Amino acid sequence: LLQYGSFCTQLKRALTGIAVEQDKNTQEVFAQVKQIYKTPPIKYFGGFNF
Amino acid sequence: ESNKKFLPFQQFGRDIADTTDAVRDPQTLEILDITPCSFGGVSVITPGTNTSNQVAVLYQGVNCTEVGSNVFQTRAGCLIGAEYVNNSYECDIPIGAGICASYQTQSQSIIAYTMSLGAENSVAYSNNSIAIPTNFTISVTTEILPVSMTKTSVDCTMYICGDSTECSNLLLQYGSFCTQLKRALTGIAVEQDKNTQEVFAQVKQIYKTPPIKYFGGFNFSQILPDPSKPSKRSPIEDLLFNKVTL
Amino acid sequence: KFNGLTVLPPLLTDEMIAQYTSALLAGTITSGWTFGAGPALQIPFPMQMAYRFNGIGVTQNVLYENQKLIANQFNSAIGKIQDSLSSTPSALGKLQDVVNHNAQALNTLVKQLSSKFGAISSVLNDILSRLDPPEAEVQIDRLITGRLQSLQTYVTQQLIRAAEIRASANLAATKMSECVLGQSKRVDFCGKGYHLMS
Amino acid sequence: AYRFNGIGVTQNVLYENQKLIANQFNSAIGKIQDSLSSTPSALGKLQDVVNHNAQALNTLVKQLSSKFGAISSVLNDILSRLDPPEAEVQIDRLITGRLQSLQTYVTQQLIRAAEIRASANLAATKMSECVLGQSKRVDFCGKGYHLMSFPQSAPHGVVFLHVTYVPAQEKNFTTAPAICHDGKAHFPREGVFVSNGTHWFVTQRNFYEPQIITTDNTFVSGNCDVVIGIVNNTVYD
Numbered sequence A: 001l002l003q004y005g006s007f008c009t010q011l012k013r014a015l016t017g018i019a020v021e022q023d024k025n026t027q028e029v030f031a032q033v034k035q036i037y038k039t040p041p042i043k044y045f046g047g048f049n050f
Numbered sequence B: 001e002s003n004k005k006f007l008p009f010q011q012f013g014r015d016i017a018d019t020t021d022a023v024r025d026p027q028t029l030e031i032l033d034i035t036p037c038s039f040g041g042v043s044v045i046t047p048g049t050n051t052s053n054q055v056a057v058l059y060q061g062v063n064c065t066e067v068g069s070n071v072f073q074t075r076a077g078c079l080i081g082a083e084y085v086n087n088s089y090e091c092d093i094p095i096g097a098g099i100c101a102s103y104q105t106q107s108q109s110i111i112a113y114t115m116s117l118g119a120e121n122s123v124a125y126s127n128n129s130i131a132i133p134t135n136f137t138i139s140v141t142t143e144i145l146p147v148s149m150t151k152t153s154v155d156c157t158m159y160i161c162g163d164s165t166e167c168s169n170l171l172l173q174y175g176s177f178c179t180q181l182k183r184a185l186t187g188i189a190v191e192q193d194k195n196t197q198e199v200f201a202q203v204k205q206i207y208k209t210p211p212i213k214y215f216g217g218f219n220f221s222q223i224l225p226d227p228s229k230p231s232k233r234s235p236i237e238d239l240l241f242n243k244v245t246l
Numbered sequence C: 001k002f003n004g005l006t007v008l009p010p011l012l013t014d015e016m017i018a019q020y021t022s023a024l025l026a027g028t029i030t031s032g033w034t035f036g037a038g039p040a041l042q043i044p045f046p047m048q049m050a051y052r053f054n055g056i057g058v059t060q061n062v063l064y065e066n067q068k069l070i071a072n073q074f075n076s077a078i079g080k081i082q083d084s085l086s087s088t089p090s091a092l093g094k095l096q097d098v099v100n101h102n103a104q105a106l107n108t109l110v111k112q113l114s115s116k117f118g119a120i121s122s123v124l125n126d127i128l129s130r131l132d133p134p135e136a137e138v139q140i141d142r143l144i145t146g147r148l149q150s151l152q153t154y155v156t157q158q159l160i161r162a163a164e165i166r167a168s169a170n171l172a173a174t175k176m177s178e179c180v181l182g183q184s185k186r187v188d189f190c191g192k193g194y195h196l197m198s
Numbered sequence D: 001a002y003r004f005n006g007i008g009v010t011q012n013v014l015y016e017n018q019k020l021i022a023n024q025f026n027s028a029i030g031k032i033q034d035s036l037s038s039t040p041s042a043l044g045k046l047q048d049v050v051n052h053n054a055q056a057l058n059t060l061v062k063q064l065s066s067k068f069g070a071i072s073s074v075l076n077d078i079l080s081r082l083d084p085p086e087a088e089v090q091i092d093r094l095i096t097g098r099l100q101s102l103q104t105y106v107t108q109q110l111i112r113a114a115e116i117r118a119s120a121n122l123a124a125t126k127m128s129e130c131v132l133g134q135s136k137r138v139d140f141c142g143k144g145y146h147l148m149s150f151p152q153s154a155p156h157g158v159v160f161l162h163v164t165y166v167p168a169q170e171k172n173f174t175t176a177p178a179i180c181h182d183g184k185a186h187f188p189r190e191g192v193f194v195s196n197g198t199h200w201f202v203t204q205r206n207f208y209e210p211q212i213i214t215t216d217n218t219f220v221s222g223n224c225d226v227v228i229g230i231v232n233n234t235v236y237d
């Protein structure tokens, strides 16, 4: 197989790029805010139920 | 040892993937399960060579029992050469399920930790209180977007056969793949031109700025073209063209 | 664990994504759209909802005189959502298709290892221990070619799928930015009707 | 001032703060060159294209030295070293390998071109919507409240400079939904009722500017016994 060439390097590169893009997708979609806000202990909002 | 109920006439065993996973000993009638030996990949974590030469090694998906003194077991595998701490920082080098690694002076060493999402905050909601701003700020941000790429063309005969007539005659027997290749490359090049044409050619008139550069106190010298230099580019454009180099 | 095929864990765990979602919910409940363009500013919820009513083109007194009815309608609509999700069998087909496609691709790639491609056998170990070196290469070459072709096909299919997945993720990010952190005026972009919140 | 009115702030806010806004804009513009120069990976997106193209071409060129199961990887020697009736067996393998390499390269190029076209379409839409006008979409032309944008050209790409308005220096206040007077409810036309502790004013959206409550900035439209949390105070005429 070593005589054929360097197809496996290309395959590995493609798979690694796919994985990195997969991580970046969730990073872009969900990590929108830079602060971790917390809801108040009392759950009254004028009659709205959450 | 196998808990498999072999009928008195079967000899081997198979699975969904159709591979051997059980066998009976000819000398002693006993069913035995066969499992593949441990294997995996190795990753090397290191800062820049300008910083240091210390490295850490991650064996992916391997229990630490199978494989300097500091060894850690993450859900991504076995980590060797790094120390774990409670301190949570922003991620520096991603590793696995919420685990990151960094080069910290503590002296200098490689540490592993759990990534931190951000700073905790809690706004004071109430029945009849509001918050109103009393001042403002003007901010300027940048965004970078690619448009086009290089256009290339390939000759089949010169690449495959060079100048050999016998090779050309042999290749002529295969078919008409080269016509398709040429068509694809030509289409790619035409689309590459069309991308810039659509992005930049928005206006049909060439407007010119007035000779006097007064706009009520606003300074636009950094983005307007510079007539002193020959290529007529703004300083920011000069910096952009100098930064990107093959 | 297959033959050289491994699955890598994602960088972010499920708990971290849940924390992000909870932070977004708390911000949009306690501050409105202010926290999406700067510091978060407190405001009572009925005042914010009256502001949204004014945004869609209705005066505030319409809401302030119908607070209980609007709250009851919102509560009932929220309550019906769980039943609607549970009753429909194909409610989450889009998310199941990804897992089905990945499993099918991996199963096909694994199953391709049992083909002979024109050799005496599909196992290298027996050929090594049954023939001699000067004649095993002829059998080995065909297996090599077939397995290389299978790997190339799998990689191409994975790339083609990843492109579409990236497009869907970009659309989801745009929707999160425009429908959750603010109020949209684009028609049929954040639901059917006049958009209020998400 | 028209753009300030577009984002929801009155003109007198700008006309009374012209020098400060100009100074802030000048400083923000000045910091951009330093920000671009200091960051090493500021222009990675544009460098990735060149890197990918060079890597693909280098791999395609390097593939010409493989033998693919022949005596040699050079046709010229085989032609001058063997005879016609036996050179075809060696030539066929080289032909097949080089054809496969060319097909792989072409497929990769097409797959990359699709993504490049998508990015170009997004850039064109951004140029149309953020530069030729003022956008109200959130986080589409920067972070904050969009004011304007400026384009610049870069190798194989474009750079957008977005100018945005960010509030600052907030303060606590006490508010009420409506004001009761003479058995009549009063709602603000535009703004919100505010109180410093002893008196009630009406202020605008994103800038503290109290005003005396009058019939010219309110409408009655209702009664006093329906609104929850109403606060009663005098209304001047």
Ligand SMILES: *[C@@H]1O[C@H](CO)[C@@H](O)[C@H](O)[C@H]1NC(C)=O
Binding pocket: B063, B064, B065
């Ligand atoms: C590693 O081996 C030990 C042996 O007792 C076992 O308890 C542990 O669960 C193994 N680790 C994993 C991740 O399976």
Ligand SMILES: *[C@@H]1O[C@H](CO)[C@@H](O)[C@H](O)[C@H]1NC(C)=O
Binding pocket: B084, B085, B086
């Ligand atoms: C994190 O803190 C806990 C507290 O009990 C401790 O048990 C654990 O060892 C700490 N992790 C370290 C030191 O890596």
Ligand SMILES: *[C@@H]1O[C@H](CO)[C@@H](O)[C@H](O)[C@H]1NC(C)=O
Binding pocket: A042, A044, A046, B127
């Ligand atoms: C807010 O107002 C409601 C009346 O609708 C009242 O029941 C509640 O106690 C108030 N909140 C607090 C914190 O007192």
Ligand SMILES: *[C@@H]1O[C@H](CO)[C@@H](O)[C@H](O)[C@H]1NC(C)=O
Binding pocket: B124, B131, D169, D170, D171, D172
């Ligand atoms: C507004 O009130 C809250 C609660 O009293 C307080 O924590 C916050 O600091 C106040 N805002 C400012 C700008 O001081």
Ligand SMILES: *[C@@H]1O[C@H](CO)[C@@H](O)[C@H](O)[C@H]1NC(C)=O
Binding pocket: D196, D197, D198, D199
């Ligand atoms: C609130 O406004 C009135 C009107 O001028 C003023 O007299 C009063 O002092 C203000 N309250 C405080 C705490 O300054």
Ligand SMILES: *[C@@H]1O[C@H](CO)[C@@H](O)[C@H](O)[C@H]1NC(C)=O
Binding pocket: D232
């Ligand atoms: C004005 O408000 C006070 C306090 O809420 C209330 O006691 C009083 O009855 C109101 N005035 C009238 C005329 O109802």
